[PDB]
Structure formats: C-alpha cells, structure tokens
Design a protein around this nucleic acid. Sequence first.
RNA 1: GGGAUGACCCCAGGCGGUAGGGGAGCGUUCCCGAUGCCGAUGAAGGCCGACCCGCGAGGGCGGCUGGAGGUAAGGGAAGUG
RNA 2: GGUGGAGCCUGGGAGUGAGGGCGCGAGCGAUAACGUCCGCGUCCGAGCGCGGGAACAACCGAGACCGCCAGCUAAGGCCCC
RNA 3: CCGUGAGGGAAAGGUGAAAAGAACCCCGGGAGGGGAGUGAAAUAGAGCCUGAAACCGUGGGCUUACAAGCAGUCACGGCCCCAAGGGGUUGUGGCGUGCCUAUUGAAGCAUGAGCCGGCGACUCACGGUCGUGGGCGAGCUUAAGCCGUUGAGGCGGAGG
Lengths: 138, 113, 155, 117, 59, 101
Amino acid sequence: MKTYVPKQVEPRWVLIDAEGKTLGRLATKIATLLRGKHRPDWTPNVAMGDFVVVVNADKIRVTGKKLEQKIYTRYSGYPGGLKKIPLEKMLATHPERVLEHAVKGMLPKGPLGRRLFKRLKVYAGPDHPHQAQRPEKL
Amino acid sequence: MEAKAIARYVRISPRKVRLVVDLIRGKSLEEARNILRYTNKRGAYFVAKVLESAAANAVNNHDMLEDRLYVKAAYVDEGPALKRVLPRARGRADIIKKRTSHITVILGEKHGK
Amino acid sequence: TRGEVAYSGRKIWPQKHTGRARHGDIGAPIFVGGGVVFGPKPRDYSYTLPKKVRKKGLAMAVADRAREGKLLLVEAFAGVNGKTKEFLAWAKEAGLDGSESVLLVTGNELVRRAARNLPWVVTLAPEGLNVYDIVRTERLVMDLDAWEVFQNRIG
Amino acid sequence: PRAKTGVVRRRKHKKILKLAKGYWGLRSKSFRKARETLFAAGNYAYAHRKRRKRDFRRLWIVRINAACRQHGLNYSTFIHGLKKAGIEVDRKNLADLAVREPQVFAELVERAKAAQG
Amino acid sequence: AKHPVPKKKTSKARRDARRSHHALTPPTLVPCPECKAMKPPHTVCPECGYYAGRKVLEV
Amino acid sequence: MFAIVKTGGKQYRVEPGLKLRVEKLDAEPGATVELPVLLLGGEKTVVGTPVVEGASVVAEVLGHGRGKKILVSKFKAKVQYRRKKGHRQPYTELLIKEIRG
RNA sequence: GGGAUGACCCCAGGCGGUAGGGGAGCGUUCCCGAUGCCGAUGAAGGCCGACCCGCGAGGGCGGCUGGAGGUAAGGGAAGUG
RNA sequence: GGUGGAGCCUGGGAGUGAGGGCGCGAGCGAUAACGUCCGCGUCCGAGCGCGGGAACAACCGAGACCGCCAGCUAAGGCCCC
RNA sequence: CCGUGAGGGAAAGGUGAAAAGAACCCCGGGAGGGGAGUGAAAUAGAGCCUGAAACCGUGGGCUUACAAGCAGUCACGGCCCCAAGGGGUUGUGGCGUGCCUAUUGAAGCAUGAGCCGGCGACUCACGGUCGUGGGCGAGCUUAAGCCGUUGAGGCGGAGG
Ligand SMILES: [Mg+2]
Ligand SMILES: [Mg+2]
Ligand SMILES: [Mg+2]
Ligand SMILES: [Mg+2]
Ligand SMILES: [Mg+2]
Ligand SMILES: [Mg+2]
Ligand SMILES: [Mg+2]
Ligand SMILES: [Mg+2]
Ligand SMILES: [Mg+2]
Ligand SMILES: [Mg+2]
Ligand SMILES: [Mg+2]
Ligand SMILES: [Mg+2]
Ligand SMILES: [Mg+2]
Ligand SMILES: [Mg+2]
Ligand SMILES: [Mg+2]
Ligand SMILES: [Mg+2]
Ligand SMILES: [Mg+2]
Ligand SMILES: [Mg+2]
Ligand SMILES: [Mg+2]
Ligand SMILES: [Mg+2]
Ligand SMILES: [Mg+2]
Ligand SMILES: [Mg+2]
Ligand SMILES: [Mg+2]
Ligand SMILES: [Mg+2]
Ligand SMILES: [Mg+2]
Ligand SMILES: [Mg+2]
Ligand SMILES: [Mg+2]
Ligand SMILES: [Mg+2]
Ligand SMILES: [Mg+2]
Ligand SMILES: [Mg+2]
Ligand SMILES: [Mg+2]
Ligand SMILES: [Mg+2]
Ligand SMILES: [Mg+2]
Ligand SMILES: [Mg+2]
Ligand SMILES: [Mg+2]
Ligand SMILES: [Mg+2]
Ligand SMILES: [Mg+2]
Ligand SMILES: [Mg+2]
Ligand SMILES: [Mg+2]
Ligand SMILES: [Mg+2]
Ligand SMILES: [Mg+2]
Ligand SMILES: [Mg+2]
Ligand SMILES: [Mg+2]
Ligand SMILES: [Mg+2]
Ligand SMILES: [Mg+2]
Ligand SMILES: [Mg+2]
Ligand SMILES: [Mg+2]
Ligand SMILES: [Mg+2]
Ligand SMILES: [Mg+2]
Ligand SMILES: [Mg+2]
Ligand SMILES: [Mg+2]
Ligand SMILES: [Mg+2]
Ligand SMILES: [Mg+2]
Ligand SMILES: [Mg+2]
Ligand SMILES: [Mg+2]
Ligand SMILES: [Mg+2]
Ligand SMILES: [Mg+2]
Ligand SMILES: [Mg+2]
Ligand SMILES: [Mg+2]
Ligand SMILES: [Mg+2]
Ligand SMILES: [Mg+2]
Ligand SMILES: [Mg+2]
C-alpha cells in the first residue's frame, strides 16, 4: 500500500471555441476534459480537472441529415406529453443546450456527474460574459 | 452542582410530557416557570410541580441561589405502563395502555456575575 | 411428555378462521407450558460388563500400584479399638503420612472404623475391591486376609 | 441434565452486534437482522477485495494514459513499447512516476517510443 | 382489522421525522405594565387587567 | 536516492529510509541483509536508468523485523444453505528497513 | 517422499457446492477428577475491548458492573447450540 | 497408451426418482410457444460465485482455498458514460 | 379468570447480615422526589439481588435540506477522540436483486418473519444389521434371583 493522491490544485479554465466541430464528436472531448481524464492526478471521486467553457454554439454543424431528424424528446411533461424537439428548433431557440444535452449523457450519473456538469458553461458565442482566463485548448 | 428533580410514576403518557419539557429544556427559571404557567397542555402541570420542586431542592438543599439558575437538562422516561382493557366490537378487547412517566428537570447555575 | 402433562386435549383454536397458528392442546411441546419433546425417561444405566473384563480390571488396578511402588501388604494392624489415634499412630510408623490418599482394604472392621473418617483414606471391605476405588486413591494398603480373598477371587 | 441455552445465545447475538456496529436501523440494532447484513456484508467484502485489485488497475491505466498523452502518444502504444523494450518496470502500481517525479516517466516514454518507433 | 392497513412499520427515521412539526410552540408572554408578571397579550390576567381593570382581589 | 524493488512478487518504490509489509520472505532473523531486484535506477546524476529484465546490476539491502500481525479480516463467503464464515487471513507480512541502492 | 524421527521436514497434485456420505473440533448443563484448586487482595453473570490465541466454533487477558459462588488437564452422560 | 478423488468387488449411509434451458437428431404441435415427449451431450440444478452479453439460472469466457494497491490473457471491447 | 355445565385454567419467588424498612426538614394536595439518616453497598429503598436486549429518552463527536436506496462493501478525502497505528463518522467514486422455505427457477409482486428475550424439534427401551475400541477366543456368556455394601461388588451357567 502506498499514497498517491492529488490535492486541490487551482483549476483549468479552458475555453473551447466550437465554431466547426460536430457535437458529440466534440462533446466526448469535452466530457473527457471535464473529468480529469487528461491530467495524471485523477482520483475519480474529487471532480478535479477542467472547468470547460465551450463557446460559439449554433453553427455547431451536425452530421448528415439531422434537419428535423435528431429528436430531443427528453421532457416528459407529465400526463400525455413526451414532447418532441428536433435539432432545428433546438438550435433556433436557446441554442445553448445541444451541447449541454450532448455532455449530459457522456458525464456519469452520480452526484459527481451532476457537479461536473455545472463546470461546463455553454454559451452562444462569442463574448461569453464570463471570462478573462482561457487556456483555449483546441 | 445540578439539583435533580425526578417525579416518578406521574401518570401521563410520556410523549405528551416530552412535548412540554422540550419547551423548557435549556431555559432560565423565571422565564421557564411562566412559560409553564400558560403553556396549554396537561404536561405543564406536572412539569410545573417538578420545576418548582427542583428550584426548591436547589435552594434549600444545595444552596444554589434561586435567581441565578436555569434548566440544565430535562427529560421524561416511560414508566410502568398500566395496561387496561378497552373492549371493541366483536369481543376483540384491545389493551389500552395508560403509560406513566418519570420527569426530570435538573437545574444548574448559569454563572455568578 | 406431551401426553403425560396435566393439560387438556382440546384444540385451543378452531384452526381455520382465527388467523393465528394452528395448535392442538396447550400440552403440545412447543407451547411454553407444554411437555418436553424428548426429555429423559428414568432408565437403568447399568450393563453387564464381562466378568473376565472385571477380573482383568481388578488385576491391572493393583498391578499399576505394584508397578509404581504404592502397594502395601500389612497384616498386624497395631491399631485396635478403631481409635483414629491408634490408626494415625499406626500410619506414622507404617509409611502413610497422610499427604497421599490410600485405599484401605481390611477384613478387620475395627480398623475400617478407624480409617473410615479421614480426608485421605477410602475405607473398604475386603470383598468390595473395585478398580474405581483403587484408582481414585494414590496408595493401596491391604490385609493378608484381604489379599488372600483378592488372589483367590481373580485368576 | 437440562442444558438451558441461557448465556450462549446472548454471547452469540452480542458477537453479531459487535461485528455490526454501524448499519442503519434494526439492521444494526436487531440481532436477527444483523446476520442478514453480515452475510451480505462479508460477501461484499469478498467481491470487493477481489475487485480492488482491478479497480486500481483501471485507475493506474488512466493515470498512465493521461500522462503519456502529455508526452504525445497513447497508452496502447506505450505498453507495447515497454514490452518490446523488455521490462518489468512501471508495473501499474508504479504509475507513481507518471504523477510525481515526472522526469522518470519522461524518460520512460523515450525508452517506449524508441523501442517501438 | 380491515381495508386500510399499514404495509410496513414506519421506522425510527420516518416516525421521528413526522414528529418534527409536533414540537410545541412556546406561549407568548408580555410583562404587564402595572407589575412585572408575564401575562399573555390582550389578557386581563391575575394582576390588575388593563388600566382600571376588573380585579381579582385589589383596590 | 530513489529505487524500485520487486520482492515477494510485487513492486515497491523505496526511498533511503522506508519499508512496510513485503509479503513474508525466506530470511528469518532480525539483523538480516537481503539482496532484491532493483528496477529503474533513481533519477540522480549517477543513476536514472530504466533497466531491461529488471537486470539492475546493484541490489538493495533489506534488514527486517519479520513478524505476522493479525489483520481484521473475517473473509467470509455466502451463497445458500451455506455459511462459510471461517476463513480469516492474517496474511503474514514482513517488516523491512532498507538501507541503500 | 526426506527421513540418521523428533515421523515436525519438504514434493506432485487437489481444494464451488444443494440433497447427501465421511472426518475433525468448539461450546452449554450435570458428573468423575473434588474432603482437591481457585474466590471478597472479588465467583458465576452483565457491559465493554481497537487487545491477544484459534480458519472458525469459541478461548484467554485487561477495564468497569456484580456481591458468592466457580470449577482446571483427561474423561464420561446429555433435556446440548 | 491411459496413476486418475480412475476402475472391479464386498459391506455401511444415502440422497434422488417434479427437472430445466441450449445445441443436435426426431416425434406430437402449425416446418407455433420460455410448448410437450424422447436420444446424444452440455450447462443451470448445486457454479451464478466471477467477466462479457445494458440488465438476465442455463448465450459466449471460465470451475471461486485465502490474501496482495503485481503480471499475462479468454468471450467481449478500445470516443464518453 | 372463562364456561350454564361437564370442564378449562393462569401468571405471580428472591431488599439486606440485621428492618437498621428511612426520624427530621424542603418542594408538593398527595404521590413522588432533594437533603439528612441507615447500611459495606440505597442507581440494595420496598412486589426492592444481578438486572441483558427490544424499546424510549437526554448530552457529546461526525454527518446530512440537488438528492436514488436489499441501505452495505472497497477505495480515497474531510473532521473530533489516540498520536506509531488506530477505531467513530461519511462526503464522493467504484460495485452491489434481502434471509428462510419450496423450487425447473425467487429480490421476488411466491411463503413465513414487527423487534427483543427466553421455551422449542433425531432422543430413548428392547431386538437386529455393519463398523470400531476392548476382553476372551472354539469357545463366549450371563439373566431373574441370592449374599454383601456406600453412591463396594461378587455368586448365580437355567439359558442364549
Ligand atoms: Mg475552481
Ligand atoms: Mg475567470
Ligand atoms: Mg368501537
Ligand atoms: Mg392429554
Ligand atoms: Mg386434566
Ligand atoms: Mg379429542
Ligand atoms: Mg397476523
Ligand atoms: Mg404452565
Ligand atoms: Mg411443565
Ligand atoms: Mg405459565
Ligand atoms: Mg478415615
Ligand atoms: Mg433449548
Ligand atoms: Mg485479476
Ligand atoms: Mg372498504
Ligand atoms: Mg417508533
Ligand atoms: Mg420531537
Ligand atoms: Mg501477535
Ligand atoms: Mg468443498
Ligand atoms: Mg461446565
Ligand atoms: Mg484462596
Ligand atoms: Mg455454570
Ligand atoms: Mg468477569
Ligand atoms: Mg474484562
Ligand atoms: Mg475442565
Ligand atoms: Mg434440550
Ligand atoms: Mg431440545
Ligand atoms: Mg414417482
Ligand atoms: Mg418423472
Ligand atoms: Mg438431465
Ligand atoms: Mg421444456
Ligand atoms: Mg437435458
Ligand atoms: Mg424438433
Ligand atoms: Mg422448443
Ligand atoms: Mg412442463
Ligand atoms: Mg450436468
Ligand atoms: Mg456445474
Ligand atoms: Mg453473470
Ligand atoms: Mg453482466
Ligand atoms: Mg479452484
Ligand atoms: Mg500490464
Ligand atoms: Mg494485456
Ligand atoms: Mg481475442
Ligand atoms: Mg361464570
Ligand atoms: Mg441476609
Ligand atoms: Mg415523603
Ligand atoms: Mg424493576
Ligand atoms: Mg434491582
Ligand atoms: Mg442526539
Ligand atoms: Mg440538478
Ligand atoms: Mg448539498
Ligand atoms: Mg446505483
Ligand atoms: Mg456508496
Ligand atoms: Mg452490476
Ligand atoms: Mg441473492
Ligand atoms: Mg431441488
Ligand atoms: Mg412452479
Ligand atoms: Mg417477500
Ligand atoms: Mg416486494
Ligand atoms: Mg402468497
Ligand atoms: Mg406453498
Ligand atoms: Mg475378543
Ligand atoms: Mg449369602
């Protein structure tokens, strides 16, 4: 038995300009960045690593045809409604959320997963009214 | 020094006395006795008797100066349950339990000014 | 048992629309007043051990004593009258000082009386020799008219 | 001879309780509900002691795969490079070099990509 | 005996959590502007009552 | 100095002075030197070599106060009508102080 | 198999388990051992213990509580878990 | 050839005689059933204890004495979970 | 106590050596206390020795009000106790379908179990069949009974 652990290191406030990247293919870079799966200090129960700020949303291009194909059903309201949202509507009103819903499936499910999702600060970019602090990892 | 008080077998169910003695646990005496003087419960009679008896056993026994004292700890416990019968329909005859209580209000001084 | 106890034999619950368990009489052994299931019944424990095993046992019981050196064959007890004064004065000159217990096998009841009553003598009749009373004491002292009956008793 | 149970059953049930101080409710105040979670607790002690040895593999592999990406290759090339160097070093319990004293790992990546590059 | 019955024993946790709001409220007491006993408010309690109040035994 | 040693089947990172439980050896007494297998050098100016086959030409020195301690174990399995409580493994350790590289 | 017996010492295998079969044991009550040995300089019992020994069953030791009985090694009979 | 918890015999103790899935060969059924009845297996039964199969007795991998913060692997995977 | 009745039919022991079983105060209507006193001991104070557990409280430590769970376990981390190493907590992660019975199969939405404490179920008599420790061994062997004891056993060959 030995002792390995990290300590509370000052965070990494990475920016991700996302003008070009397809979501998902981007978002599994983002989730692997959000957990500390890239620094070798990684204990899996501390939520270390990056506070990723992905900006420059919609014109997140998506793959071949997902114009009214990719359905964001998620909200069961509660009596008769599984209410469906295609990606055109998702990028139209509060675009801002196709990345949030892309990383909220690639993060884990426990309270550390929920804490880790609060690190990801999606905006519709540029000028994320948030920052002066950007190791813009691309 | 903390004057004990215990009034045993006082014949009132102990949850109903816990509800009034929680109200006086930790309070000063001139405050708490007149909390109990208008607390609308049955507990606030037996606890009033045992609070007055505790203040008297602080004065006349342990010389503990009636003004400068509060209720250090205060707790009731279940005593020997008087198990009566309450007859029901169809001869069922359930066992009603007159529970009894053991009331304690130990009283200690706050600090000499 | 279940049957011998002084309870009744009435089915104490009518078994069907009561809701509780199905039970026979209170004398059933699972009830707390009930009988016992398999408790002991008064039996004779004694059994015929073979007579050759008894005789070989009483041979080897004194063979152990003679193999150690804790056997003695006196005849003239100087202690007449059964006085324990006389017996202890006899034992002082005999060599049974009292720290080691002795089986005393005499056909003289007026020294069986003397040695009946000590913390270290098991008094014994000359006919009542037996391996348990041999072994439970550390010495053995017997008369010539007890050794003769023992020698003719065993082969 | 009637042999009462008496002292024996209390000495067994306090043993189960002393072994089970800590669980929730009647789960650890109940001397027949604490066998039911000392059986399953000892069973999890078994399966998780055998799972700790692979949990720590699947931790050290992550620390190596995150520290070798810092040196510009992936772990699957790294261990192939190590086993073609011919080693019994770094031996994922010794994914400590990759965390602290990092220049030893910064030379091990060189001896990896050299031996398979 | 019948139709609505507890499926399980409520443990110490849910019982002693349902007995949270049954903590009794302490009564309100104000100090009686004639002499300093703690009447409840709006109450002609046994000192004097209000000013010129209805008396127990006093002048 | 820095050192890494395989002994008893596992591999430990060792300093100038530290060692704990080491999976009990075949070296009985207290004052007992021992020559294990160094692995990768130690990052000074003189050393720093990761070594093929573990064939580090120098060993370590491992004095030891050997003795098993009993460990709070109760290593019990259970399937069902089955209760095999009875395996507790105190698992004989060995207590090394190491000297040099 | 090694054994200059002390059969401890190693060697090749094996070692999931229900019904079951078989072998070791630990405990409780009682008895022999006991007219003995412990015990108010505290018995059985109770509460603890992070100690000790035992794979475990359990056994010791220590601390209080208890205020008077307990019973060794080896054995025996069970109203034995 | 085969030293294996192989065999053969005698004696003691059994349990079991409600099985099931899958594969293959068929019957009955409808070239239906997680159907039913067999034969050869296998596996669960008692191995779901473990890995994969998202979960899942019998599908795929594999027979769990115990430990280790060591290693190589099978089915399966290698973007994240 | 139930039953009209025949009948059924309970529970319920232990103060201490001695009642010396608490004079006298103080609170309270009293009960009950607190002093004082007794006594070695009064958490031995009266349906009173020990007085466990379930249960119910009070005080303290840790912990929880964005969390998800057969309630654990492993791993780290945080914090008060001991300062080597520990136990107590549990924040996060990983992993986890209760026990018994009956089952082809149970977490099972099959059965039983509110919890705790006690009582509770392979014995025994006489025969038989195999084994084993013994004795004797082509011999073996007592039964009832008789005689004697102190928790002495011999004699008894009818018979098997
Ligand atoms: Mg930060
Ligand atoms: Mg900033
Ligand atoms: Mg009614
Ligand atoms: Mg009868
Ligand atoms: Mg009768
Ligand atoms: Mg009848
Ligand atoms: Mg019912
Ligand atoms: Mg009775
Ligand atoms: Mg009886
Ligand atoms: Mg009774
Ligand atoms: Mg005598
Ligand atoms: Mg019993
Ligand atoms: Mg492994
Ligand atoms: Mg209705
Ligand atoms: Mg409750
Ligand atoms: Mg409350
Ligand atoms: Mg030790
Ligand atoms: Mg086995
Ligand atoms: Mg005994
Ligand atoms: Mg003595
Ligand atoms: Mg006893
Ligand atoms: Mg004791
Ligand atoms: Mg002790
Ligand atoms: Mg003994
Ligand atoms: Mg019994
Ligand atoms: Mg029994
Ligand atoms: Mg049949
Ligand atoms: Mg059949
Ligand atoms: Mg079959
Ligand atoms: Mg079928
Ligand atoms: Mg088949
Ligand atoms: Mg077919
Ligand atoms: Mg079919
Ligand atoms: Mg069928
Ligand atoms: Mg099979
Ligand atoms: Mg199998
Ligand atoms: Mg499985
Ligand atoms: Mg699986
Ligand atoms: Mg195996
Ligand atoms: Mg490897
Ligand atoms: Mg590999
Ligand atoms: Mg492969
Ligand atoms: Mg009548
Ligand atoms: Mg007396
Ligand atoms: Mg009085
Ligand atoms: Mg009492
Ligand atoms: Mg008492
Ligand atoms: Mg509390
Ligand atoms: Mg949320
Ligand atoms: Mg919170
Ligand atoms: Mg979960
Ligand atoms: Mg957890
Ligand atoms: Mg799982
Ligand atoms: Mg299960
Ligand atoms: Mg079956
Ligand atoms: Mg069925
Ligand atoms: Mg159920
Ligand atoms: Mg259910
Ligand atoms: Mg049912
Ligand atoms: Mg049924
Ligand atoms: Mg013979
Ligand atoms: Mg005669």
